[PDB]
Amino acid sequence: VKIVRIEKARDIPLGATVRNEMDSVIISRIVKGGAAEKSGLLHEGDEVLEINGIEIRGKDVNEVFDLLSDMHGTLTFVLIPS
Amino acid sequence: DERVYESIGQYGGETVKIVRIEKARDIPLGATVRNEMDSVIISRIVKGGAAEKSGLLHEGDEVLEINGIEIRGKDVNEVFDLLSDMHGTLTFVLIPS
Amino acid sequence: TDERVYESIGQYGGETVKIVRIEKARDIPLGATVRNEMDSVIISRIVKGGAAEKSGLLHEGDEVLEINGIEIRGKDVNEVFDLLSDMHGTLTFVLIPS
Amino acid sequence: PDLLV
Amino acid sequence: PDLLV
Numbered sequence: 001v002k003i004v005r006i007e008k009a010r011d012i013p014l015g016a017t018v019r020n021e022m023d024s025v026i027i028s029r030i031v032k033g034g035a036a037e038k039s040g041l042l043h044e045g046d047e048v049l050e051i052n053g054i055e056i057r058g059k060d061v062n063e064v065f066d067l068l069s070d071m072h073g074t075l076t077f078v079l080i081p082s
Numbered sequence: 083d084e085r086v087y088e089s090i091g092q093y094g095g096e097t098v099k100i101v102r103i104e105k106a107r108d109i110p111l112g113a114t115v116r117n118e119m120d121s122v123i124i125s126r127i128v129k130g131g132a133a134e135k136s137g138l139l140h141e142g143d144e145v146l147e148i149n150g151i152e153i154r155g156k157d158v159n160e161v162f163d164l165l166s167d168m169h170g171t172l173t174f175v176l177i178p179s
Numbered sequence: 180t181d182e183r184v185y186e187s188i189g190q191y192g193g194e195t196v197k198i199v200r201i202e203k204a205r206d207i208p209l210g211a212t213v214r215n216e217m218d219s220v221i222i223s224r225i226v227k228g229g230a231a232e233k234s235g236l237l238h239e240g241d242e243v244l245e246i247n248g249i250e251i252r253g254k255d256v257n258e259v260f261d262l263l264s265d266m267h268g269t270l271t272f273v274l275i276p277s
Numbered sequence: 278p279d280l281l282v
Numbered sequence: 283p284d285l286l287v
Contacts, residue, residue, distance in 0.1 A: 009129075033179045106232075108208070109207065109208055109226060109229050109230075110206070110207055110286050112286075113286075113287055114285065114287065115285055115287050116284045125284045128205060128286075129205070130203075130230075131207050134204075161285070162285045162287055208281050211282055212280065213280055213282050224279065226281070256279070256280050259280070259282060260280045260281075260282055
């Protein structure tokens with residue numbers, strides 16, 4: 001279990017595409033040059049369990065987009081790496 | 083037999099961006115710079131600075147030129163001096179990340 | 180004759196106190212030069228295109244009484260410079276316009 | 278000699 | 283360190 005912090009600006013994406021697998025929310029790609037690539041803490045293959053005290057596991061891929069679009073500053077990610 | 087494998091090593095090139103940003107006399111643009119080899123790279127964009135509000139300067143861009151002056155191949159201490167004596171519309175020639 | 184009354188000699192309408200908020204970026208100056216007139220601190224110039232000029236709430240002539248709960252009146256301008264260099268975000272200014 | 282600030 | 287500019 002990995003607990004990491006990655007900065008994000010208002011309405012500027014982190015650069016991490018999300019894929020759904022059963023209930024669990026997964027990260028499928030890391031965008032070249034984004035805040036997820038330059039930090040080195042978010043990887044293609046990790047599972048997103050929580051983001052800033054909000055349960056991500058068991059949520060639709062469209063809800064994780066909405067939750068993230070209204071986020072800024074230090075984002076605490078609870079993950080299960082590949 | 084003859085088996086032909088075309089287009090190997092294909093590349094779509096790089097984009098060159100030409101933008102203009104306002105600078106006030108002795109008020110910094112709000113973008114930290116670092117030297118990566120010869121080139122000059124923007125490493126950070128300060129929250130609320132002239133570069134952040136404009137939306138034309140980004141963390142990762144390469145600065146080729148500023149107001150007709152070659153920035154690539156110059157020490158960041160020289161870019162600092164060049165920029166400190168600048169004001170008004172500054173034309174930036176960049177290679178985005 | 181006998182009693183002549185001349186009222187309101189030395190009438191004054193008072194001063195205005197202005198309370199404004201301006202955004203400041205970390206290590207990016209507001210763009211306002213300051214001078215010390217007696218004890219008080221006075222804005223002498225507003226830099227063309229700076230955060231103060233765009234906001235329109237800081238003017239050449241204003242007296243700076245306070246900035247973010249810190250007494251500016253009666254301080255050296257070298258101290259106001261130091262206080263301001265470590266400031267960012269919404270700065271609340273208490274002023275007496277010209 | 279008027280500091281920028 | 284990186285310079286402000």
